[PDB]
Amino acid sequence: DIQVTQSPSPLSASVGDRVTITCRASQTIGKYLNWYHQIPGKAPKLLISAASTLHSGVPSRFSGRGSGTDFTLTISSLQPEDFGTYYCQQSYSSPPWTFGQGTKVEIKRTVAAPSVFIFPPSDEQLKSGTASVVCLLNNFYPREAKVQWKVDNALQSGNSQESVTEQDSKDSTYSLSSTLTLSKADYEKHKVYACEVTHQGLSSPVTKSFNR
Amino acid sequence: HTSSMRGVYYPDEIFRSDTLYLTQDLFLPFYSNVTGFHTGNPVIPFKDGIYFAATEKSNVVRGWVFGSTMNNKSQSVIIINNSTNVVIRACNFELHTMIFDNAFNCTFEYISDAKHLREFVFKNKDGFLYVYKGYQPIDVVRDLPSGFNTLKPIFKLPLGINITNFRAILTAFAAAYFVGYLKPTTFMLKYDENGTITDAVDCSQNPLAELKCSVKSFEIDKGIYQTSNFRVVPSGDVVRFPNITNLCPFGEVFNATKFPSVYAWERKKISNCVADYSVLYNSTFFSTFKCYGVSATKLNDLCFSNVYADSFVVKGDDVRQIAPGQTGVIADYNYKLPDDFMGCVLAWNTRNIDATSTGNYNYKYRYLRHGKLRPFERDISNVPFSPDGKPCTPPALNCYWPLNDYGFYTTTGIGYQPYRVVVLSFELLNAPATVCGPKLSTDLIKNQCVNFNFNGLTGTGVLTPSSKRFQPFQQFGRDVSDFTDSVRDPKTSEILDISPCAFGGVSVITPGTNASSEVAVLYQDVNCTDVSTAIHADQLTPAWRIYSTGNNVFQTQAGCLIGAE
Amino acid sequence: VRLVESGGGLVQPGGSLRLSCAASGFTFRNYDIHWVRQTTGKGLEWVSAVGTSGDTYYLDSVKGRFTISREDAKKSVYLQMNSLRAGDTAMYYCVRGDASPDNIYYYMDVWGTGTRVIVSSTKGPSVFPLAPSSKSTSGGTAALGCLVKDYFPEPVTVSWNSGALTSGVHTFPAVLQSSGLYSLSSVVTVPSSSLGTQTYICNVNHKPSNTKVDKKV
Numbered sequence: 001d002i003q004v005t006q007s008p009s010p011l012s013a014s015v016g017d018r019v020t021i022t023c024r025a026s027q028t029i030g031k032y033l034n035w036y037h038q039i040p041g042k043a044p045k046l047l048i049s050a051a052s053t054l055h056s057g058v059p060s061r062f063s064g065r066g067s068g069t070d071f072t073l074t075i076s077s078l079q080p081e082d083f084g085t086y087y088c089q090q091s092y093s094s095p096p097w098t099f100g101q102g103t104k105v106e107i108k109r110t111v112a113a114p115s116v117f118i119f120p121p122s123d124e125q126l127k128s129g130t131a132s133v134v135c136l137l138n139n140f141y142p143r144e145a146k147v148q149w150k151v152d153n154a155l156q157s158g159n160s161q162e163s164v165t166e167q168d169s170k171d172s173t174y175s176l177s178s179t180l181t182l183s184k185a186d187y188e189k190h191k192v193y194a195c196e197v198t199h200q201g202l203s204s205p206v207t208k209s210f211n212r
Numbered sequence: 213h214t215s216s217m218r219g220v221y222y223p224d225e226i227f228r229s230d231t232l233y234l235t236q237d238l239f240l241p242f243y244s245n246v247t248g249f250h251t252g253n254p255v256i257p258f259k260d261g262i263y264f265a266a267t268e269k270s271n272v273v274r275g276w277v278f279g280s281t282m283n284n285k286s287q288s289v290i291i292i293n294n295s296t297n298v299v300i301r302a303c304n305f306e307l308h309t310m311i312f313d314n315a316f317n318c319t320f321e322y323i324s325d326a327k328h329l330r331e332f333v334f335k336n337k338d339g340f341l342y343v344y345k346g347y348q349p350i351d352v353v354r355d356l357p358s359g360f361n362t363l364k365p366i367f368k369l370p371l372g373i374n375i376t377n378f379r380a381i382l383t384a385f386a387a388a389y390f391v392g393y394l395k396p397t398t399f400m401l402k403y404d405e406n407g408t409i410t411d412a413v414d415c416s417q418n419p420l421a422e423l424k425c426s427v428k429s430f431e432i433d434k435g436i437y438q439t440s441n442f443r444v445v446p447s448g449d450v451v452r453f454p455n456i457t458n459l460c461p462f463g464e465v466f467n468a469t470k471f472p473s474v475y476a477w478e479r480k481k482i483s484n485c486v487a488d489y490s491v492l493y494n495s496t497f498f499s500t501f502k503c504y505g506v507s508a509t510k511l512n513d514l515c516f517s518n519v520y521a522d523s524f525v526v527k528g529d530d531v532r533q534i535a536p537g538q539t540g541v542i543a544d545y546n547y548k549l550p551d552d553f554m555g556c557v558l559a560w561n562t563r564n565i566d567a568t569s570t571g572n573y574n575y576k577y578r579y580l581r582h583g584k585l586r587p588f589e590r591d592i593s594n595v596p597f598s599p600d601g602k603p604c605t606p607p608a609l610n611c612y613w614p615l616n617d618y619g620f621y622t623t624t625g626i627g628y629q630p631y632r633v634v635v636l637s638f639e640l641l642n643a644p645a646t647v648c649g650p651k652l653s654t655d656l657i658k659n660q661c662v663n664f665n666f667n668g669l670t671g672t673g674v675l676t677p678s679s680k681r682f683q684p685f686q687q688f689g690r691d692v693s694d695f696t697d698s699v700r701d702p703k704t705s706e707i708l709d710i711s712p713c714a715f716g717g718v719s720v721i722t723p724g725t726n727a728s729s730e731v732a733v734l735y736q737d738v739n740c741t742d743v744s745t746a747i748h749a750d751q752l753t754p755a756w757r758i759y760s761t762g763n764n765v766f767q768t769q770a771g772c773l774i775g776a777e
Numbered sequence: 778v779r780l781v782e783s784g785g786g787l788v789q790p791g792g793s794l795r796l797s798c799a800a801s802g803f804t805f806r807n808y809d810i811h812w813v814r815q816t817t818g819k820g821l822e823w824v825s826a827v828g829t830s831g832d833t834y835y836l837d838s839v840k841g842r843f844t845i846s847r848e849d850a851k852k853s854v855y856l857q858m859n860s861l862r863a864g865d866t867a868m869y870y871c872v873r874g875d876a877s878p879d880n881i882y883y884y885m886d887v888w889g890t891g892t893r894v895i896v897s898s899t900k901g902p903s904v905f906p907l908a909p910s911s912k913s914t915s916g917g918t919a920a921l922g923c924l925v926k927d928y929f930p931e932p933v934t935v936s937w938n939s940g941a942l943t944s945g946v947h948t949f950p951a952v953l954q955s956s957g958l959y960s961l962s963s964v965v966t967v968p969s970s971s972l973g974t975q976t977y978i979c980n981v982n983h984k985p986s987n988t989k990v991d992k993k994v
Binding site for chain 2: 802809826828829830831832833834874876877878879880883
């Protein structure tokens with residue numbers, strides 16, 4: 001079909017207002033393409049029309065251009081109430097109304113150092129036969145760090161789930177919660193549980209561990 | 213003798229929380245000329261929408277009989293209040309005592325048994341009588357005081373009668389009428405706690421009220437603000453797509469007992485029709501119904517210049533290259549399609565027809581040809597091929613027919629079944645409308661700010677005849693700003709269309725709501741010379757009722773600030 | 778111009794569950810009405826729509842399973858989901874299509890609020906209280922723990938004594954495990970003095986079995 005690919009990297013919006021939101025497609029379309037906006041938490045809404053018919057509801061600062069197959073979304077001075085993900089949809093294939101993927105727009109501030117703290121499993125969970133290894137990662141601006149799990153010099157992966165919160169409005173930092181669920185036998189077999197944290201804003205990879 | 217913000221009623225009965233709703237059906241603009249009669253015996257005026265108000269005690273004016281011309285000419289509804297016995301009769305005629313006059317034919321007997329100011333607003337729309345009730349204690353005897361007087365409906369009996377008069381006033385009294393006409397405008401209401409209004413803003417009295425209605429807020433800061441000035445003078449709506457013509461042959465397309473091959477697809481031209489588009493929506497068995505230029509639903513709303521039909525048979529899942537851009541063996545050798553196709557495609561299964569259990573070798577396709585096909589190209593050649601000349605008599609060395617027959621059978625897969633693809637090529641070239649939707653048209657109203665809905669040109673403005681440089685084959689025309697300038701009528705009387713509309717949307721400069729109560733306007737792009745002429749003649753779009761002009765100054769990008777010298 | 782959703786979703790994969798989309802004072806007798814499927818981290822995959830005529834569009838995947846119907850006077854649009862599978866758990870929206878000149882764009886003019894139709898089983902949340910108070914790290918900076926597990930719906934929130942100091946912390950969104958249950962990990966920052974001071978009560982509540990449980994960690 002009409003495969004449309006957006007920008008595969010979120011654009012961290014600084015104090016500037018120079019965005020390069022692209023909505024390139026496979027074939028060529030004159031103006032059979034629109035742009036939307038969805039703040040995470042609510043329903044989406046129309047942001048930019050087909051580059052020449054921007055109507056009310058959206059401020060006139062948000063501009064739009066497009067022709068052929070390379071589309072550009074030029075935006076004026078950014079406002080704090082105009083953040084979120086902007087989607088684009090093709091209007092050529094009429095029955096298959098397929099939208100795009102999504103381009104997230106976040107806030108840019110000073111780099112913060114994540115306070116790495118790994119916590120042992122709870123006491124009451126041991127009575128049920130399960131074990132949860134939770135490693136906390138809070139107070140960090142760069143939302144690009146990944147958590148590595150190593151137990152007794154053995155690479156542990158595939159059984160861990162991470163949860164990242166939205167960017168706060170007080171310190172503009174992120175918080176990550178990586179939980180590694182292990183069985184009771186695998187927990188009692190090992191003694192050392194290390195939480196390897198690799199972050200860009202850190203000069204050295206900080207690794208915390210504890211003994212049973 | 214002036215309606216000081218009187219006549220505000222609820223537009224519906226749905227409860228709403230604290231919000232700012234924009235009402236369109238509300239009537240009785242504020243500060244309107246009310247024809248109060250401070251009194252062939254009565255002074256019965258035309259109705260045109262009225263506003264009933266009684267400022268006399270002892271219940272002097274307690275009866276009003278709606279209907280039409282008297283002297284037994286049309287049905288009339290009698291609304292009389294006598295000893296708390298409100299009997300609403302709508303059958304008595306007139307060849308206090310106007311009830312027992314004639315008894316030719318009576319029906320629909322409705323009986324409802326059970327200083328002072330009682331306000332009533334009567335509305336008749338599409339044969340529906342809306343009656344509201346409102347009371348407000350007053351003490352002055354000069355004229356109608358100010359207030360809000362939230363109205364509440366009491367009776368909504370349609371009766372299918374267009375009311376035009378009111379009569380049957382009592383006697384032996386003071387006795388006044390206080391009836392005022394209403395005009396269709398827009399209103400902005402406030403929804404406070406407990407479901408009360410207590411505040412309304414009519415967006416038709418002053419430019420300041422229009423500015424307040426623009427930003428949807430009861431407080432205006434300093435600066436310049438304006439939103440299209442599209443809530444000043446509304447009117448009706450004109451339509452197009454005139455009376456139907458001979459039926460479109462789209463039905464006979466999906467009925468042929470035999471269908472051509474892929475390389476010999478037949479091109480049938482369709483013109484001078486009114487397509488119903490019912491065989492495309494209904495009978496949902498088209499497995500590959502796709503549209504590329506126009507929306508798959510917005511088909512009965514456009515007038516295409518010329519439509520066609522391309523019927524051919526493809527083998528199962530091979531229907532993936534009848535789309536603009538797709539390449540393959542059935543995209544450059546048998547059937548092509550332009551990059552901007554602007555049309556729909558369909559495909560339905562024919563397994564129970566074009567398939568046998570002993571050999572259905574009757575369909576072929578071209579798979580070897582020098583170069584690629586151009587958009588909408590057809591070739592029915594049959595000759596061995598070789599890219600060095602080579603007439604290539606069949607059995608000489610390696611010559612074979614560049615046409616592979618299909619393998620249609622009964623016990624096969626889904627991807628190897630005959631799918632008949634009918635390709636409808638829509639067009640919007642410069643030519644008279646040959647195919648439209650099954651709609652009806654009305655008369656072309658001149659000199660009225662009615663919204664126009666042409667074949668493919670919508671919008672609003674003052675449709676006025678003019679004279680420009682048009683061509684016989686050209687139907688419509690656009691402006692420099694990609695706006696509809698002129699367009700001929702599809703039915704008859706091919707003439708020019710709406711002239712240039714009002715000179716942009718005038719802005720309202722307000723230095724602050726709490727600062728003062730003054731109001732000033734700022735025209736975006738005008739000449740500050742014909743503005744007064746367009747306003748005083750009620751021909752301009754932002755034409756306010758209570759509006760004047762004090763001084764106009766013309767400079768580079770003047771923007772005549774009317775409201776302060 | 779606003780559309781309000783109704784209902785939700787609780788049935789298991791293999792059942793029927795319909796939706797509804799109301800309207801407002803706008804003229805809802807000539808515009809279009811389509812659906813939108815947002816899987817909370819995936820693409821908006823829905824193409825079904827009904828027009829003014831008897832036009833009924835569907836998706837190539839869910840074909841012959843779902844049916845659409847609209848009512849002009851009632852200002853409501855329905856969407857029945859027969860033979861519901863487990864890969865449809867998402868938030869369903871209602872949109873409107875309109876073209877300004879004649880046909881060019883649809884604009885997806887007015888959206889709705891959403892309706893979550895989840896297809897799985899439900900259980901009771903189990904909180905893990907009695908976090909390690911002082912066993913390996915007492916001074917410096919630390920954090921508590923009120924991890925919850927085994928709960929299908931997540932109408933939960935963890936307040937910290939309804940607010941008594943100025944520290945600043947927020948909870949984490951839940952994550953669906955492989956078994957089919959959710960889990961939350963609520964943490965709290967430590968003030969200038971927390972050892973032997975004002976404690977914190979994790980107010981985990983809103984259990985489908987109407988069994989509240991709160992305990993200090």
